[PDB]
């Protein structure tokens, strides 16, 4: 019951998907051949982990997932990799020619050749569900598949599944690892197209993640495998409430209720702690009180925003591991005293907390220390709009001279589609401003 | 006017419903399997009020357990008295209400409400003479709040001449950080003004403050909060459960407590205040039960009764004690604090005395006051509500299920009327 289907679109989407499902397997004691010695309910089950994993006769626990890409290189590595046996081939879907960093190719020219097949396979997963919660969609803002095909799929999923929840994990572009000059363009287009089809979207700023890998893990020049391993921990935190349960556990949909005041204001800010090396973590254990404080240090934010110059509309704390109510309560009391934390006048100021006792694990040869307890804060702050602004400025500079616009028109798009996407983005920044204003 | 049908809806509803049955079962000498093993015969005199009888003279609660997710009911069924309940009287869905009144009252709940009413009907035909129904639920979530008020509106339709009683847990930010609870509560109040005869206003603000201040519990749990509710519910229904003279059925209680059809929101108090750890070796004196049960610290509603005036009061004393002294101390409060009782309802304080005391105490006092100060509670919610509604915040959860802004405006409006009506008679 309450199953959740993950959809991993494009390179970023797929590679992050790898990290995530490896980690989930390590969290639930699932081997790379799908077998799970803990599960005595053979062939079936009602357990918490069954919302992300189906079971088979052989005793094999199978990710409720689909990996889609318009080119086979990245998914091919999955097909041949450590966790090859974990999936069924019908779940790994590849084209031949990618979208060449072109939204238009992803949404139309190449995407249309494969959208039906993907939906057919998504549908086949939905049929295994007693009661589907919704979908999780992992994608890059910048790629052509990540942007264009994702918009197409999301639109198609709105139609085929009506209003079943659709959550995004969107990789926001950073210059230190950008692959295309036109990623601002692709970003604004997918964001606009997906906006009214997405219930809730967790933006991951790569510059933020690159920053944290450099600073807290002393990684000299972070790789994708570096960012992904950190990103996976964060996703794991957010999905923990869906995959585990205990008395103190609060369902993600409950956090969602607090976090989204209006259907367009559905972009929460993630801040995670502790991110700490094994060298620093040795002999130094971090308290409930200590990790809670980190959540309000912008260095630990997942998007480069400044919540201090913005107003709060909500605060959630997703604790996992060795955390007790008593300590959490005292911890928040501190921060209520030691910080200022302005809320808008129309929202209350209570923090919705959830706790999963199941402690964070780490992937072998990871760079992250194996901690006893950890926390992810989900905040709805006006400051998240800063992310749109930086991207909207980058977009503006190029479209002024119609730079690169011709690779898009040639695939079938119009200038009208651009100006339109950009107007939605302007409205969204305006919207994110309107909510910060005080009432009368 | 003999049998009562009990219902409990949602998380809060089922948890306190369960604890309520745990408690009175122990008082009426009924074990988890349903057999009787008690000394006094006062325990079985009006046992037919809340329980049914079966083969082997086992006693089965007249209780219907309702939820939109299986969670709390699975937990209750494997709870202590779990197997005591009629298995068929477990009626649950799987979708949940997501703390949404609209989901509870209009969509996800409508999909289930008929099936519940079937079990209600089956119980009501077993009744030689039905008084009415007592519901236990929170006003802050979705199932108990939304589906609960729907069940009332529907049950009033099949049994309009019966009495509708509720134990309604009012939300507080001190206990819940769900932002929409003031929406859920305002919508529910509108329903309760219209379609209940009696409503016990169990305030989670009060219960938390009581647990933290008086009982010195630094990390109050639901079990702590519910131990207080359990005690109140035992006391308030004592005049119903054992042989007595005053407020001995729901209709009579209503007639004594309700001077005007809408103002039926009661302020419960209790003494001595007890935590599950507290020793309570020293029984209190009758004068101590009295000074406390009128003390704001013992009120379960988080209102200052000195800010308004008592329209009516019931006061129930339990355990072996001087019935002579009970009257003097009772007549003392009335005469000491006479300004706090309305003059235009003579002798508005009525008293009963039951011999059997509550589990673990020798002397207990329960308070039932129809104070005008109850408005402060509704004023509290009203403010938490408008703070959001003026910016139309979080309404999309509700409009998305089919509701309209106008329906909010009217529930806002009808509760503001309620407050003003409670203020009309406070200056009389």
């Amino acid at each position: 019951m309450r199953e959740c289907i993950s959809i991993h679109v494009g390179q970023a989407g797929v590679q992050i998907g790898n990290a995530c499902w490896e980690l989930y397997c390590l969290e639930h004691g699932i081997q790379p051949d799908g077998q799970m010695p803990s599960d005595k309910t053979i062939g079936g089950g009602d357990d918490s982990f069954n919302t992300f994993f189906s079971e088979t006769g052989a005793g094999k626990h199978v990710p409720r997932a689909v990996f889609v890409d318009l080119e086979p290189t990245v998914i091919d590595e999955v097909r041949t990799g450590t966790y090859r046996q974990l999936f069924h081939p019908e779940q790994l879907i590849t084209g031949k020619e990618d979208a060449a960093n072109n939204y238009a190719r992803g949404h139309y020219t190449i995407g249309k050749e494969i959208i039906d097949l993907v939906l057919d396979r998504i549908r086949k997963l939905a049929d295994q569900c007693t009661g589907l919660q919704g979908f999780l969609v992992f994608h890059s803002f910048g790629g052509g598949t990540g942007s264009g095909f994702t918009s197409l799929l999301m639109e198609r999923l709105s139609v085929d599944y009506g209003k079943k929840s659709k959550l995004e994990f969107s990789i926001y572009p950073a210059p230190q690892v950008s692959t295309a000059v036109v990623e601002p363009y692709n970003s604004i287009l997918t964001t606009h197209t997906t906006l009214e089809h997405s219930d809730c979207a967790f933006m991951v700023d790569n510059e933020a993640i690159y920053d944290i890998c450099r600073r807290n893990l002393d990684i000299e020049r972070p790789t994708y495998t570096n960012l992904n391993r950190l990103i996976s921990q964060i996703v794991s935190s957010i999905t923990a409430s869906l995959r585990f349960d205990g008395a103190l556990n609060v369902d993600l949909t409950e956090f969602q209720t607090n976090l989204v005041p209006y259907p367009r204001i559905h972009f929460p800010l993630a801040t995670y702690a502790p991110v700490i090396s094994a060298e620093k973590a040795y002999h130094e254990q971090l308290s409930v009180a200590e990790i809670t404080n980190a959540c309000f240090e912008p260095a630990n934010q997942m998007v480069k925003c400044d919540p201090r110059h913005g107003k709060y509309m909500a605060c959630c704390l997703l604790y996992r591991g060795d955390v007790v109510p008593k300590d959490v309560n005292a911890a928040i009391a501190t921060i209520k005293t030691k910080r200022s934390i302005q809320f808008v006048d129309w929202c209350p100021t209570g923090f919705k907390v959830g706790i999963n006792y199941q402690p964070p694990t780490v992937v072998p040869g990871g760079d992250l220390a194996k901690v006893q307890r950890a926390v992810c804060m989900l905040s709805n702050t006006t400051a998240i709009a800063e992310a749109w602004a930086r991207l909207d400025h980058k977009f503006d500079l190029m479209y002024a001279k119609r730079a690169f616009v011709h690779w898009y028109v040639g695939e079938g798009m119009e200038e009208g589609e651009f100006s339109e996407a950009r107007e939605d983005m302007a409205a969204l920044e305006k919207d994110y401003e309107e909510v910060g204003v005080d009432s009368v | 006017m003999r049998e009562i049908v009990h219902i409990q809806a949602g998380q809060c509803g089922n948890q306190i419903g369960a604890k309520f049955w745990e408690v009175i079962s122990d008082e009426h000498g009924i074990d988890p399997t349903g057999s009787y093993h008690g000394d006094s015969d006062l325990q079985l005199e009006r046992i037919n009020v809340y329980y049914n009888e079966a083969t082997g003279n086992k006693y089965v609660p007249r209780a219907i357990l309702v939820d939109l997710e299986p969670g709390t009911m699975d937990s209750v069924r494997s709870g202590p008295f779990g197997q005591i309940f009629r298995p068929d009287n477990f009626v649950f869905g799987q979708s949940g209400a997501g703390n949404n009144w609209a989901k509870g009252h209009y969509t996800e709940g409508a999909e289930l409400v008929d099936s519940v009413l079937d079990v209600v009907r089956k119980e009501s035909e077993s009744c030689d003479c039905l008084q009415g129904f007592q519901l236990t639920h929170s006003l802050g979530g979705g199932t108990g709040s939304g589906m609960g008020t729907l069940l009332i509106s529907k049950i009033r339709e099949e049994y309009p001449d019966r009495i509708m009683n509720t134990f309604s847990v009012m939300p507080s930010p001190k206990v819940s950080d769900t932002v929409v609870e003031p929406y859920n509560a305002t919508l529910s109040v509108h329903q309760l003004v219209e379609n209940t005869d009696e409503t016990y206003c169990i305030d989670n603000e009060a219960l938390y403050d009581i647990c933290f201040r008086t009982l010195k519990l630094t990390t109050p749990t639901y079990g702590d909060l519910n131990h207080l509710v359990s005690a109140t519910m035992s006391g308030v229904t004592t005049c119903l459960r054992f042989p007595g003279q005053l407020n001995a059925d729901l209709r009579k209680l209503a007639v004594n407590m309700v001077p005007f059809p809408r103002l039926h929101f009661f302020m419960p108090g209790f003494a001595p205040l007890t935590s599950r750890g507290s020793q309570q070796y020293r029984a209190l004196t009758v004068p101590e039960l009295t000074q406390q049960m009128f003390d704001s610290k013992n009120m379960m509603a988080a209102c200052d009764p000195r800010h308004g005036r008592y329209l009516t009061v019931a006061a129930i004393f339990r355990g072996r004690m001087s019935m002579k002294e009970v009257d003097e101390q009772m007549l003392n409060v009335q005469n000491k604090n006479s300004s706090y009782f309305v003059e235009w309802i003579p002798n508005n304080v009525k008293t009963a005395v039951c011999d059997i005391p509550p589990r673990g105490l020798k002397m207990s006092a329960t308070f039932i006051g129809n104070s005008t100060a109850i408005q402060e509670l509704f004023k509290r919610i009203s403010e938490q509500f408008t703070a959001m509604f003026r910016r139309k915040a979080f309404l999309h959860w509700y409009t998305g299920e089919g509701m309209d802004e106008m329906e909010f405006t009217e529930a806002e409006s009808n509760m503001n009327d309620l407050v003003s009506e409670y203020q009309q008679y406070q200056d009389a």
């Binding site: 103190l248 309560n329 907390v353 | 206990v175 989670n204």
Partner: peptide, 5 residues
Amino acid sequence: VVXXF
């Protein structure tokens, strides 16, 4: 506020 029966 973190508050379990």
